[PDB]
A paper describes a structure:
The Alc. vinosum LH1 is a closed ring structure composed of 16 pairs of αβ-polypeptides, 32 bacteriochlorophylls (BChl) a, and 16 all-trans spirilloxanthins that are uniformly distributed around the RC. The Alc. vinosum RC contains a tetraheme-cytochrome (Cyt) subunit and four BChls a, two bacteriopheophytins a, one 15-cis-spirilloxanthin, a menaquinone (MQ)-8 at the QA site and a ubiquinone (UQ)-8 at the QB site. The cryo-EM structure of the Alc. vinosum LH1–RC complex identified three forms of α-polypeptides (six α1, nine α2, and one α3) and two forms of β-polypeptides (ten β1 and six β3).
The Alc. vinosum LH1–RC complexes used for cryo-EM analysis were purified using two different methods: (i) one-step extraction using n-dodecyl β-D-maltopyranoside (DDM) followed by sucrose density gradient centrifugation (hereafter designated as sucrose-density), and (ii) two-step solubilization by lauryldimethylamine N-oxide (LDAO) and n-octyl β-D-glucopyranoside (OG) followed by DEAE chromatography using DDM and CaCl2. The two structures are virtually identical in both protein conformation and cofactor arrangement with a root-mean-square deviation (RMSD) of 0.37 Å for the mainchain Cα carbons but they differ in the number of divalent cations bound to the RC Cyt-subunit. A total of six Ca ions are located on the periplasmic side of the Alc. vinosum LH1 complex and are divided into two groups: four on one side of the LH1 ring and two on the opposite side.
Author numbering:
A (entry chain L): 2 to 278
B (entry chain C): 23 to 333
C (entry chain 3): 5 to 66
D (entry chain Q): 5 to 47
E (entry chain Y): 1 to 64
F (entry chain H): 1 to 259
G (entry chain M): 2 to 319
H (entry chain W): 1 to 54
Write the structure that this text describes.
């Protein structure tokens, strides 16, 4: 179906590729050329994940427990070449399908943006999430010299990867880009709660009260912290905090291993060894 | 900042990320600083025995004079090459023990001989040599004493932590893990081995002490935590590496060295060999490994000197 | 072939081409630094360290 | 004196003064409790 | 080598160039001094010569 | 009290399951709040049954909530019911999910990117009751910041670089001091039309406002306001939507595809 | 290219807004507002005025005492050397009491100062919470911010007060320091068997990730429709315009479902709040009802099993 | 030594130069004392000289 105000917006055109061939809707979704490509990229990737679960690490360890399902990358001994399907090659195909699905999803958003005549901030913001994924499975493995540095595709097994990569630097909290990325993540969560609270508290005021104005919003945080960023700028700030967190997270993992091999606390020895002290 | 790619050694299962990363140029520099000494030519078999020629040989009495002379030449290179043969001897009287270096070095021979014969769970036929620690220096470069930590006001009890220290690889972890673990035998394990609480009262602060020790262990061997652990379960031996078993014996081996060999020599050593708390310079993991997963990157020097093995 | 400059902005074409060539040059130089055979920053008289008496640069792995 | 209240708001000053005194009172009791010689809640 | 090099000040602001030059030279001067102090060879304060007359009369902590 | 509830169940397992029940209830609540706009859905399922089947999915709609607007501007119910509206377009193909081709001139069709709802025909009011979006000629105490170029007198150019007019005045938000619209005097008939700041690319060096949305000739058909010194919420949407249609309708190449 | 609405090209100056009038008997707002040009390029140019009531004043006094005690103990830990204070500042911290003291009050340098700093900081945070409650109440607004702040306070209390009391030891609490509290975070996970396997740690991350996801989605969405006045969210909520319709329609065409201009802020509010609610619960479960999270995951079939390519002989099993 | 050097003050604000110069010289003065205090040879407070009271 479509929203009660949606029909006047369902217009032909705005496609990047395909023209009128794929320009249609399936239920609520707009498909387009990249919806078709993205769906079958996703379909093949999901089916190979299920097949990877079906064969498992081996026959005895095979499991359909969704927590324990894991499709692992190749051994580092394979370098940047292709691996046999049951020795990490399935991970390589799924990664390619994932990249195809994510880029198609981003490009489908571009076509939707063109149909609606709105800005391209949303596909641009999603590209940062894709870029972070690309750093994890493409850029860092290539810089490290092996596809085996990618994280395994498993709900809990990719947490074991994060844990062990973190302890490859003995104390990952001292990663300066990690500290900056966490600061943006925590600040974003704080800024999101503040923004959600302010909008809700103004449009849903006290019992027997009218909806507040923009003056109330500015006055409220000026009364608390002495500064109000503004109704428009809080969305810039929220976008900046969220994208900066992902950018610095991509930096933090790409410098871990490729551009730094010692323990992360040792990186701060440049500060400790300044001749000032 | 370093430049990629590092030399990576995979230890665990693929995707588990149990790997060792080595900067090839940093590794090259480390190896050049940890080169072994070429073994002396083999002594001539036969000849006079030490027992019926020398007067005050109490440890190496099972050798022949040819091998004994070769041993003294080697330990001179290993310990006191600049100071020469007179560093450990009274000039003109070889049998004299009236010099502290002679008394210490005799106990050092027992240390090496006990290590090469009774601690193969750790040194595994590679063995140790006087050069493994001393590296041509009378005082080994990497030794430790009980660290008081940074200076504190007279009425402030030291915490022993929250202070940037190279002993814990520049973290704020408790900066003196040597004393409770490598000299005393404090429990290193802190993690409970049941899903639900079952009486493990170990404090979170005690985990920071184990973490500090593990930072020093990993820095001493130039490895990361995954060299011996699967970080998803640090307690679990089934998911660990064989190097964790070796490191377990090394901890007991170092305690044996410090308690039974270094500590009884404290009275003989001068004041310059002691820390602020009066304890002598002691042996840590860094003393032999000196930043490498094996001392001298696995160079085999002890096997060429039969004087370094117990009879 | 002036037709190229009829359809492509000379300012944008040169900015793109200059950035591309500079990026390509940086990439190729790094590709040579990756290989120790062509790593000229090791010095003209570079000699790899000699491993003797059972030394191994790297710990055993998989 | 007395004119000090012509430059200091009595409303803001009393709250700041009483808050400081309460914090000071809490601080001193905490210090005495920390001191084994003056902790009055022991045997 | 350029007889009419003085025309550069018709394009780049003299005050901003002077501010940037003075700021950049100061940072460069600090950086070079810090770099030299970081090295053992060129640290003129800890190199020994002129035969430092300060004695470290205290039990040392060799690990730190 | 112990950590173990049965041989297999423990407190942590019960707590996580307790969260899932709450989280499931929370999602139902949030989805119910989501469906206060644009519901019941418009579908061929409803059209073919003659309105007998309402498409709302799950969860169904919530009870109406009231927003009491300030300055007694009325009370608006969020899950309201709107009158049926006819689009100014025809389907390209008859199969469900097919798009529509706008009728007549696409810029003036009021369809697609140029489509817009009929908002309330009253100005947005400040906290004191004054109109919020007003030109600088009546917001006298408002002024351009000293370090920023004054938009007045700048030249407005269209997508193709052709001159469309000059900025006669600047419209600002009184509640939050920011520029909202540029009042452009069209140099074709001398009629002042509003240009939203979101469709304006300032060129400070040349004192030029670049409008990539529409051509210079399209400024003559920008929707106009009844009162020259205030704009209603209804007219704000009409002005912004007209420029938005240009992003897809101004040029033939903008409909795509690239290849 | 097209104006991306990231920076304000042309700023307009108006006389500084004093604020919505507060009810009778409220203190006047302090500070003469100023206009920062650079603050106006990204956001609103006006800085100030601020309201500093009785509760805010008390929070300030309690808060400064906590910060002063922390800083003094940091300076004491480097034996008053202010130069060494700056060098080690990130590594410096105020340690909680040693484990042998339990919940008793230890001497000053053995955790006594930590308890005072912990108490004074807690009081200032609670007083600041009352301040946020009263500012919303004074303006006739609802208490959503206070609820969200209370959720964050709940997690803060779980870290330093509730869990240490449950464990019967102040030594379980968080040190006051930059790197020391990171060491605590790492040691906490290590001590209790890989906090990755705490399901409420997993949920907390999902919501922390979701918060960045939602704000990126919502922030980009509002900037995308800001050309239709989408930033004026109150007007869009009360009288739905084309900005709110296009925003909702974009997400319906993208992922098959959408929120409203109002309910997206309910998704935003709950995602951020659940981050610290689940964080607090997961902390309270750790050490109290679960000793080892990895072994708990093994018990409940959550931890994956890997082929045994590497193993160690247990030296205790002899 | 350029005789017409006074014209610099027609380019750079004299007040902003004085503030920056005084701010820099104070930071530079603090930095150099700190550098000396961190060395063993030039720490005039911990070098023992003269005598040894403590
Ligand atoms: C703790 C964090 C983690 C928690 C766990 C999270 C797990 C992951 C969650 C995954 C959620 C997937 C949602 C997919 C939506 C699919 C579209 C849809 O129909 O929406 C249904 C529903 C709304 O239905 P509706 O639009 O009112 O119904 C329209 C009519 O029924 C229309 O009538 P109809 O007859 O068309 O209805 C059939 C309907 C039936 O739908 C269902 O059965 C439900 C599907 C989801 C279950 O299916 C469709 O409408 C689609 C038609 C067929 C097309 C399918 C293929 C599309 C191909 C084109 C793709 C191009 C690329 O949307 C949702 O249920 C959304 C759930 C959101 C869950 C969020 C939880 C995760 C985030 C938590 C953190 C955030 C902060 C929380 C505080
Ligand atoms: C050695 C430790 C001794 C001890 C020795 C002392 C000494 C010495 C003193 C106290 C003082 C106090 N002790 Mg004692 N005290 C001990 C143990 C306790 C215990 C306990 C559970 O163990 C408690 C709850 C207290 C509580 C108190 C408070 C009643 C008082 C601090 C008030 C204050 O800070 O006002 C500051 C906070 C404010 C908000 C000030 C404003 C006051 C009100 C709001 C305004 C009233 C105006 C009015 C006209 C002025 C008179 C007020 C009078 C308090 C009646 N003590 C132990 C046994 N205690 C102090 C005292 O007597 O002060 C009166 C004091 O000098
Ligand atoms: C022992 C482990 C170490 C540690 C080791 C690591 C390692 C290793 C990593 C991090 C990374 C991160 N760490 Mg850390 N980290 C530690 C402790 C912490 C603590 C803490 C409280 O202690 C915090 C808050 C963090 C926080 C962070 C973030 C900065 C970052 C993760 C976010 C991110 O990368 O976004 C990026 C977001 C993505 C990659 C998501 C991609 C989305 C894609 C494009 C879309 C997928 C669509 C999907 C399939 C749809 C499904 C369909 C459904 C139906 C919906 N770490 C400890 C000390 N940390 C990671 C990082 O920085 O990566 C860049 C990383 O690799
Ligand atoms: C080796 C270590 C020596 C030492 C060797 C030196 C050397 C060498 C120098 C100093 C200098 C200084 N030392 Mg010392 N100093 C030592 C120990 C100390 C100790 C201490 C607690 O131990 C302190 C507090 C000081 C402090 C000082 C300051 C008085 C002075 C730094 C000036 C400055 O920072 O410019 C900040 C100033 C400004 C930003 C404004 C200055 C310009 C003003 C407006 C004009 C003033 C003109 C003139 C000075 C006034 C006099 C008029 C006359 C008639 C000409 N020293 C030890 C014993 N010290 C420096 C100095 O003498 O500077 C003057 C200097 O060159
Ligand atoms: C960059 C800032 C933050 C951000 C932004 C962001 N994300 C976005 C967007 C934006 C702006 C979208 O517009 C887009 C969207 O549609 O949102 C609803 C999206 C999106 N972000 C999503 C998820 C997501 N974002 C994350 C993070 C972030 N997204 C950042 C924190 C994470 C994290 C941290 O884990 C996740 C899981 C989706 C809901 C959606 C993109 C949907 C998509 O790409 O669909 C195509 C793919 C499928 C339909 C199925 C997957 C097909 C694959 C072949 C399967 C294999 C995947 C993987 C390789 C293995 C499994 C993973 C294991 C780790 C378990
Ligand atoms: C939804 C969960 C997220 C969240 C939410 C959240 N946080 C919040 C709120 C909310 C909803 C608030 O309303 C509240 C706030 O005010 O926000 C602006 C706050 C807040 N969250 C803050 C921080 C914060 N939030 C964090 C995290 C999070 N907050 C979560 C991610 C973190 C992290 C990740 O670590 C931090 C550090 C504060 C900015 C603020 C609460 C401030 C507070 O309680 O302050 C108390 C008072 C003091 C400490 C004053 C000390 C400083 C003074 C300058 C001292 C000197 C004064 C004077 C000069 C003394 C004079 C001498 C004396 C002797 C008298
Ligand atoms: C059971 C079964 C059939 C199994 C088979 C599975 C198989 C084989 C294949 C399936 C896999 C395949 C092929 C998938 C193909 C692609 C498909 C169908 C994708 C589905 C879409 C999808 C990924 C949905 C996920 C959405 C999720 C989980 C999270 C999104 C983030 C989130 C929490 C959003 C909720 C909040 C909302 C609605 C935000 C949007 C939103 C924002 C951000 C505003 O700012 C705004 C402003 C003003 C008005 C409205 C809005 C608004 O709606
Ligand atoms: C201007 O400032 C000056 C210069 C004067 C002083 C400067 C000081 C400085 C530089 C301070 C710097 C401080 C820093 C860097 C602090 C960092 C702090 C961090 C990172 C803290 C992080 C976490 C801490 C937590 C979570 C602590 C939680 C503690 C709690 C909740 C404690 C509660 C304790 C209570 C309620 C105590 C009860 C005591 C009982 C026994 C009742 O008391 C008797
Ligand atoms: C047989 C070979 C060895 C000989 C001959 C030898 C000799 C000596 C001598 C003479 C001293 C005293 C030096 C001095 O105080 O100036 C000494 C001290 C010491 N040796 Fe050895 N040693 C040997 C092997 C080892 C080994 C294998 C280790 C490491 C485990 C070791 C560690 C130490 C330490 C820690 C000290 C104390 C520091 C010191 O006093 O200088 N030695 N050794
Ligand atoms: C084409 C351009 C690149 C040419 C060179 C090839 C790649 C190698 C880069 C330089 C390698 C090197 O020797 O660097 C040494 C120094 C020392 O490294 C650094 O300081 C770089 C630190 C990391 C910065 C990021 C590098 C790029 C990785 C991808 C980042 C993606 C971020 C956005 C994700 C959304
Ligand atoms: C919010 C805290 C709820 C109460 C938690 C109390 C746990 C502390 C231990 C109480 C019992 C102590 N003991 C030794 C008698 O068992
Ligand atoms: Ca090292
Ligand atoms: Ca010198
Ligand atoms: Ca002196
Ligand atoms: Fe919003
Ligand atoms: Mg600590």
């Amino acid at each position: 179906a479509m929203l009660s105000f949606e029909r006047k917006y369902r217009v032909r055109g705005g496609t990047l590729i395909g023209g009128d061939l794929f320009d249609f809707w399936v239920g609520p979704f707009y498909v387009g050329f990249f919806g078709v490509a993205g769906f079958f990229f996703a379909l093949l990737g999901v089916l190979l994940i299920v097949w990877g679960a079906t064969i498992g690490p081996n026959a005895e360890l095979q499991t359909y427990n969704i927590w324990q399902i894991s499709i692992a990358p190749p051994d580092l001994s394979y370098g940047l070449g292709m691996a046999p399907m049951t020795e990490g090659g399935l991970w390589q195909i799924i990664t390619i399908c994932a990249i195809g699905a994510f880029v198609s999803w981003a490009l489908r958003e571009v076509e939707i943006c063109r149909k609606l005549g709105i800005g391209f901030h949303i596909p641009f913001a999603f590209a940062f999430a894709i870029g972070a994924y690309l750093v994890l499975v493409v850029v860092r493995p290539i810089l490290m010299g092996a596809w085996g540095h990618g994280f395994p595709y498993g709900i809990l097994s990719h947490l074991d990867w994060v844990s062990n990569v973190g302890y490859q630097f003995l104390h990952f909290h001292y990663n300066p880009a990690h500290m900056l990325a966490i600061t943006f993540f925590f600040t974003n969560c704080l800024a999101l709660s503040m923004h959600g609270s302010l909008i809700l508290s103004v449009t849903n005021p006290q019992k027997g009260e009218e909806v507040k104005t923009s003056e109330h919003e500015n006055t409220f945080f000026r009364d608390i912290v002495g500064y109000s960023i503004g109704a428009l700028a809080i969305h810039r700030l929220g976008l900046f905090l969220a994208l900066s967190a992902v950018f610095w997270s991509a930096v933090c993992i790409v410098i871990s291993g490729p551009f730094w091999t010692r323990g992360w606390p040792e990186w701060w020895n440049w500060w400790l060894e300044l001749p000032l002290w | 900042c370093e430049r990629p790619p590092p030399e990576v050694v995979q230890k665990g299962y693929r995707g588990v990320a149990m790997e060792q990363n080595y900067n090839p140029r940093l590794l090259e520099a480390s190896i050049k600083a940890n080169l072994p000494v070429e073994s002396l030519p083999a002594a001539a078999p036969g000849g006079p025995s030490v027992s019926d020629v020398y007067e005050n040989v109490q440890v190496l009495k099972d050798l022949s004079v040819a091998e004994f002379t070769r041993t003294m030449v080697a330990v001179t290179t290993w310990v006191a090459p600049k100071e020469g043969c007179n560093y450990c001897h009274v000039p003109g009287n070889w049998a004299s023990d009236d010099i502290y270096t002679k008394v210490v070095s005799r106990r050092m021979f027992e240390l090496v001989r006990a290590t090469n014969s009774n601690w193969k769970d750790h040194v595994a036929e590679t063995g140790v040599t006087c050069y493994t620690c001393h590296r041509g220096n009378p005082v080994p470069k990497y030794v430790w004493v009980t660290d008081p930590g940074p200076n504190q006001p007279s009425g402030v009890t030291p915490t022993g932590q929250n202070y940037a220290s190279s002993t814990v690889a520049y973290s704020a972890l408790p900066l003196d893990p040597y004393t409770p673990f490598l000299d005393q035998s404090n429990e290193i394990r802190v993690i409970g081995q049941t899903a639900l609480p079952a009486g493990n009262t170990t404090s979170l602060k005690q985990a920071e002490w184990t973490y500090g020790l593990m930072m020093q262990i990993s820095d001493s061997l130039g490895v990361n935590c995954t060299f011996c652990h699967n970080s998803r379960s640090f307690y679990d031996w089934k998911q660990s590496t064989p190097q964790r078993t070796t490191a377990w014996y090394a901890i007991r081996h170092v305690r044996d060295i410090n308690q039974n060999y270094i500590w009884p020599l404290n009275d003989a050593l001068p004041a310059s060999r002691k820390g602020p708390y009066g304890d002598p310079f002691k042996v840590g993991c860094m003393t032999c490994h000196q930043g490498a997963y094996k001392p001298l990157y696995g160079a085999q020097m002890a096997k060429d000197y039969p004087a370094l093995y117990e009879s | 072939l002036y037709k190229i400059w009829l359809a492509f902005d000379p300012r944008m074409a040169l900015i793109g081409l200059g950035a591309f060539l500079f990026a390509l040059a940086l990439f190729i130089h790094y590709m040579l630094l990756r290989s120790p055979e062509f790593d000229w920053l090791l010095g003209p008289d570079y000699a790899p360290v000699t491993l003797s008496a059972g030394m191994s640069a790297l710990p055993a792995g998989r | 004196m007395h004119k000090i209240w012509q430059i200091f708001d009595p409303r803001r000053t009393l709250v700041a003064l009483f808050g400081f005194l309460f914090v000071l009172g809490l601080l001193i009791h905490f210090i005495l409790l920390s001191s084994p010689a003056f902790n009055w809640l022991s045997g | 080598m350029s007889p009419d090099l003085w025309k550069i000040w018709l394009l780049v602001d003299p005050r901003r160039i002077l501010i940037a030059v003075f700021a950049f030279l100061t940072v460069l001067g600090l950086a070079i001094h810090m770099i030299l102090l970081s090295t053992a060879e060129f640290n003129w304060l800890e190199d020994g010569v002129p035969a430092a007359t300060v004695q470290q009369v205290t039990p040392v902590v060799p690990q730190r | 009290m112990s950590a173990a509830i049965t041989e297999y169940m423990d407190v942590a397992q019960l707590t996580i399951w307790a969260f899932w029940f709450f989280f499931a209830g929370l999602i139902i609540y949030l989805r119910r709040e989501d469906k206060r706009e644009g519901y019941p859905l418009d579908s061929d399922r409803t059209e073919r049954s003659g309105g007998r089947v309402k498409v709302v999915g799950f969860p169904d709609l919530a009870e109406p909530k009231t927003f009491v607007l300030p300055h007694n501007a009325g009370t608006v119910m969020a899950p309201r019911v709107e009158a049926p509206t006819s689009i100014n377009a025809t389907p390209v193909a008859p199969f469900p999910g097919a798009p529509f081709e706008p009728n007549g001139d696409p810029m003036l069709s009021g369809f697609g990117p140029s489509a817009s709802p009929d908002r309330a025909k009253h100005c947005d009011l400040t906290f004191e009751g004054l109109p919020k979006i007003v030109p600088l000629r009546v917001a006298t105490d408002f002024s351009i910041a000293e370090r920023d170029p004054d938009p007045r007198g700048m030249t407005v150019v269209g997508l193709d670089g052709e001159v469309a007019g000059t900025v006669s005045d600047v419209w600002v938000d009184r509640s939050e001091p920011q520029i909202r619209y540029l009042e452009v005097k069209v140099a074709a008939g001398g009629k002042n039309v509003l240009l939203p700041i979101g469709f304006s690319r300032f060129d400070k060096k040349a004192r030029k406002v670049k409008v990539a949305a529409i051509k210079a000739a399209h400024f003559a058909n920008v929707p106009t306001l009844a009162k020259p010194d205030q704009i209603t919420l209804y007219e704000e949407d009409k002005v912004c939507a007209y420029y938005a249609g240009g992003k897809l309708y101004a040029t033939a190449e903008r409909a795509g595809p690239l290849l | 290219p097209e104006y991306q609405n990231i920076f304000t090209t042309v700023q307009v100056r108006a006389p500084a807004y004093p604020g919505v009038p507060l009810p009778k008997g409220s203190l006047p707002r302090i500070g003469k507002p100023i206009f920062s040009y650079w603050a106006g390029k990204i956001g609103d140019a006006q800085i100030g005025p601020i309201y500093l009531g009785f509760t805010g004043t008390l929070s300030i006094i309690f808060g400064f005492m906590a910060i002063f005690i922390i800083g003094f103990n940091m300076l004491a830990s480097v034996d008053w050397n202010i130069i060494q204070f700056v060098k080690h500042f990130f590594w410096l911290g105020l340690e909680p009491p040693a484990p042998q003291y339990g919940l008793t009050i230890p001497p000053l340098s053995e955790g006594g100062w930590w308890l005072m700093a912990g108490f004074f900081l807690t009081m200032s945070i609670l007083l600041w919470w009352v301040r946020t409650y009263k500012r919303a109440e004074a303006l006739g607004m609802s208490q959503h911010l206070s609820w969200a702040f209370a959720a964050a306070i709940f997690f803060y209390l779980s870290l330093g007060f509730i869990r240490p009391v449950m464990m019967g030891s102040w030594a379980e609490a968080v040190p006051f320091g930059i790197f020391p509290h990171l060491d605590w975070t790492a040691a906490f996970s290590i001590r209790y068997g890989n906090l990755y396997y705490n399901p409420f740690h997993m949920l907390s991350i999902a919501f922390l990730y979701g918060s960045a996801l939602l704000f990126a989605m919502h922030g980009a969405t509002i900037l995308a429709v800001s050309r239709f006045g989408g930033d004026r969210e109150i007007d869009q909520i009360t009288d739905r315009g084309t900005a709110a319709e296009r925003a909702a329609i974009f997400w319906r065409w993208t992922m098959g479902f959408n929120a409203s201009m109002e309910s997206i802020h309910r998704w935003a509010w709950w995602c951020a709040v659940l981050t610290v609610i689940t964080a607090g619960i997961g902390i309270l479960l750790t050490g109290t009802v679960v000793e080892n999270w990895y072994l708990w995951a093994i018990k409940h079939g959550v931890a994956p099993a890997y082929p045994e390519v590497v193993t160690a002989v247990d030296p205790y099993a002899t």
